[PDB]
Design a protein around this ligand. Structure first.
Ligand code: HEM
Ligand code: HEM
Ligand SMILES: Fc1cccc(C[C@H]2C[C@@H]2NCCc2ccnc(-n3ccnc3)n2)c1
Ligand SMILES: Fc1cccc(C[C@H]2C[C@@H]2NCCc2ccnc(-n3ccnc3)n2)c1
Ligand SMILES: C[C@H](O)[C@H](O)[C@H]1CNc2nc(N)[nH]c(=O)c2N1
Ligand SMILES: C[C@H](O)[C@H](O)[C@H]1CNc2nc(N)[nH]c(=O)c2N1
Ligand SMILES: [Zn+2]
Lengths: 407, 411
């Protein structure tokens, strides 16, 4: 019931007590582990609200205070009469910060307490959402000195009036098919790009076209908006050795901003809650550039380096992978746009873990996601046992709106 | 109940029914996943159903389920258990069992080869000297002058727990580690403790960076005895790099035969505590883990310096750069010396095919993602994008405590 996690590089052992507060389920059973699967009412709501308020008031050293009891009081009254309740700003911010703190797949959580929270619960229209999102992008981007942020739109009422950002990220590149049968741009966004087209986007059928926002306010049909170019900070990718690298014509954006997730706090659901931090270099160079079903530029780079691509055993893929990632880090650092390498990030995360074990009694962590997609075992997290479990407040996946939307 | 795993590169979806035949616990619960945790005397009582289960499996595989031969065998095993509190496996069952423990080994990326396993039956063995001879023959057979063949040698099963056969080495072939008084380590830091035991047991240590350890062998629960593997049987490979000539001057070499000697093989309820097995190396086991782990030989810095990389900030990716050249070196050296080795691209690609073949013909393939994904360049291998289910089937290989922690010393 009290569990130990060992680091096999340092023999450091930590004891987890925090998992005993876990409420949600993992997909795993005692007969089967699903650790590598990507996705495994008034009476319902009051316990949830209670669990949250209890931990909020505990966090501000006022557990069992009259203020605490009064709040539980007031919230229960509100639920019974209204079937829902509203968070005070202090609770909202605490909840958002803790949803990040509890995000077991996020390596950047050492930063969790410095989140800037934008309260957009007063928003009513897609133009309103657009304004808030532009403000978020500009704040977070900060001319390249990135700052973590979340913007929180109104909570779900009866599920017929949901606020949704249809984009998976605020800033992504379009993807179009060709009669050539190949794929132009980012293959990840082919389907979303088409929904932009059918809704009326005028695509400039290029390779790196910043997608428009598709914004749904109050269960209404979603609308298109172009993010002001001047707010989208982009980075041309060059190598600090290979002059020919720039001729590949690669660029990437500075702001990584997840916008399709669901923020759950005290039983309330915030279906539109885009958030951003800053890039770990591998996200771009390993995943975005080298994944087969993404930009998949390995062979092209490999040829330009004149590598022996006859046999896999020359490790030409590995050699090219490294240089691409060198270039990404270099390009971002040169243009003074915040970025972290996987060595520094994972080093920070081990520090955060030990802090969390020390000051909270544990830290949920999904090893499959925390270990970087290159050079796994030369980063300290590889050797770190981790326990994965779900705490609330939380960020949850939710279905794509185009499968659900009653047009 | 059916379970689907998806490959996120190819969108190939597979369906697992095999997990239903899983009995053993995983460590995980509905509330916690222990997928990244490394490690999360049997009565006649529990023994017959374990025997029956195994023999039902055996007889299904040979298309003789429910046959008279099947029924007579259950009867025979039942009677033997009831009167002797245990039983002996036929040779055919042993072979079937060992192959299937390999097949079920969820952490082994090499399982495409599972049906090709030379099984050596050493159940007639009674002494440490006898064990040494059997292990010598295994090393010679498996090495095959560089053309490696998978093999396993099976010593007699556990009886009362007081007469265990054990190989105290973790691998048949490994280099000594020596803690120096200044806190540094000469040789392989992983084997410091075992090296000390050996020395205590009377081993005369040459005290160099690459000393092949002696075998420490326990027969029938007696105190273990030291033997030296004949050097001529230990195939080694000097590490050089195809383009960097200073690389050979690092003085590196490795042995060619990877052989695990400390696991327990469970078949039909019987426990085989000494069952050393060997395959061949995936290059990253040596180049990534053995050389570049901070807690092992740890040569990244020295390699990096000699390459004149920018080592001032990690963001130069000097570590990733040195790591790659070292792994190129390991592959180059082994191929050049005609010693069997597989790169992680080839091995993972084959595993995906194996795994897909297993879903069709078998209804599943238990796999541990945390272990199947290679310790470098993970996402440019197909396994990274492959959802996998982990569960425990028998026959199986299991961990067991190190024998120096449990052994009752005779004198
Ligand atoms: C500030 C620097 C940050 C860094 C370096 C960072 C790093 C990462 C990385 C590398 C991933 C893996 C994503 C993938 O491979 O798809 C991730 C996922 C995630 N991050 Fe962060 N992050 C940061 C900020 C944030 C913030 C501000 C939040 C929320 C307030 C957050 C919440 C999450 C969540 C919920 C996931 C899981 C996403 C999923 O399941 O697809 N992160 N993070
Ligand atoms: C023939 C080529 C083989 C290859 C390329 C191969 C590859 C591997 C690799 C890379 C690992 C991970 C080891 C680690 O990181 O500690 C492993 C583990 C394992 N393999 Fe193999 N293997 C082969 C043969 C075999 C054979 C012949 C057996 C048994 C009959 C076997 C059973 C296992 C088991 C039980 C493990 C898990 C060991 C542990 O948990 O420490 N493999 N294999
Ligand atoms: F389960 C899935 C199946 C298919 C696609 C998927 C999308 C998952 C990969 C994306 N996860 C977020 C990636 C991302 C992008 C931009 N920024 C961040 N980000 C920002 C701060 N922290 C993370 N993360 C899930
Ligand atoms: F749970 C643990 C905690 C700390 C160390 C540990 C040892 C792991 C490394 C051993 N795994 C086997 C390594 C190995 C060596 C030589 N050959 C093979 N090999 C041969 C065929 N298949 C694998 N494997 C476990
Ligand atoms: C199938 C497997 O779970 C999947 O490929 C995961 C592996 N680990 C990951 N890790 C991160 N950070 N991001 C990912 O998208 C994935 N994908
Ligand atoms: C903590 C973590 O489970 C541990 O370091 C694992 C990670 N994956 C591994 N994978 C392989 N093949 N071998 C290992 O020793 C490990 N170690
Ligand atoms: Zn699990």
């Amino acid at each position: 019931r009290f569990l130990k996690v060992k680091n096999w590089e340092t023999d450091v052992v930590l004891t987890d007590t925090l998992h005993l507060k876990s409420t949600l389920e993992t997909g795993c059973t005692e007969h089967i582990c699903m650790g590598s699967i990507m996705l495994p009412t008034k009476d319902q709501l009051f316990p949830l609200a209670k669990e949250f308020l209890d931990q909020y008031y505990s966090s501000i050293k006022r557990f069992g205070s009259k203020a605490h009891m009064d709040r539980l009081e007031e919230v229960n009254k509100e639920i019974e009469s209204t079937s829902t309740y509203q968070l005070k700003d202090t609770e909202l911010i605490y909840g958002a910060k803790h949803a990040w703190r509890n995000a077991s797949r996020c390596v950047g959580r050492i930063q969790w307490s410095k989140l800037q929270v934008f309260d957009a619960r007063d928003c009513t229209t897609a133009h309103g959402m657009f304004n808030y999102i532009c403000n978020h992008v500009k704040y977070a981007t900060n001319k390249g000195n990135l700052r973590s942020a979340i913007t929180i739109f109104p909570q779900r009422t009866d599920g017929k009036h949901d606020f949704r950002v249809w984009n998976s990220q605020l800033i992504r590149y379009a993807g179009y098919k060709q009669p050539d049968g190949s794929t132009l741009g980012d293959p990840a966004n082919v389907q979303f790009t088409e929904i932009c087209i059918q809704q009326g986007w005028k695509a400039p059928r290029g390779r790196f076209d910043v997608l428009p926002l598709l914004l749904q306010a109050n269960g209404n049909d979603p609308e298109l908006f172009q993010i002001p170019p001047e707010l989208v900070l982009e980075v041309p990718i060059r190598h600090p050795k290979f002059d020919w690298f720039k001729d590949l014509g690669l660029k990437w954006y500075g702001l990584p901003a997840v916008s399709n997730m669901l923020l759950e706090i005290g039983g309330l659901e915030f279906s539109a809650c885009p958030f951003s931090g800053w890039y770990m270099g591998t996200e771009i160079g390993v995943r975005d550039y080298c994944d087969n079903s993404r930009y998949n530029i390995l062979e092209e780079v490999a040829k330009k380096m004149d590598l022996d691509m006859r046999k896999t055993s020359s490790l030409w893929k590995d050699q090219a992978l490294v240089e691409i990632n060198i270039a990404v880090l270099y390009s971002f650092q040169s243009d003074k746009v915040t970025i972290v390498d996987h060595h520094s990030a994972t080093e920070s995360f081990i520090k955060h873990m030990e802090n969390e074990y020390r000051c909270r009694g544990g830290c949920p962590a999904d090893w499959v996601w925390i270990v970087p997609p290159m050079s796994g075992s030369i980063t300290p997290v590889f050797h770190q046992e981790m326990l994965n479990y779900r705490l609330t407040p939380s960020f949850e996946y939710q279905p794509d709106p185009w499968n659900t939307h009653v047009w």
